[PDB]
Amino acid sequence: ESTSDPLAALDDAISQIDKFRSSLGAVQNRLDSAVTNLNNTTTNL
Amino acid sequence: ANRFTSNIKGLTQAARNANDGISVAQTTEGALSEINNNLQRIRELTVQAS
Numbered sequence: 001e002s003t004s005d006p007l008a009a010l011d012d013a014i015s016q017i018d019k020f021r022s023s024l025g026a027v028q029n030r031l032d033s034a035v036t037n038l039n040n041t042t043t044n045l
Numbered sequence: 046a047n048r049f050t051s052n053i054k055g056l057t058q059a060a061r062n063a064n065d066g067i068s069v070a071q072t073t074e075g076a077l078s079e080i081n082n083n084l085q086r087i088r089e090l091t092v093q094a095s
Binding site: 007011018 | 047051055
């Protein structure tokens with residue numbers, strides 16, 4: 001029994017993967033901003 | 046960009062499929078012409094038979 005809507009399901013899976021990647025890249029940038037904060041504040045301290 | 050790539054690959058594959066379909070149609074029309082020649086010959090010689 002073939003899938004009823006193959007292409008739609010594939011598109012939804014790809015969208016889910018891309019959403020996870022976007023959420024993960026956001027936290028990448030977030031941690032890097034934290035790293036910049038850390039050295040900047042430790043030099044002043 | 047991912048969504049554009051999806052459409053790009055799908056459209057390339059669909060174009061190849063459409064080329065295969067037009068090949069099918071060409072083959073069928075050639076067969077029909079080969080039949081029609083003999084059918085017209087049958088008509089012509091039936092006119093003589095009349």
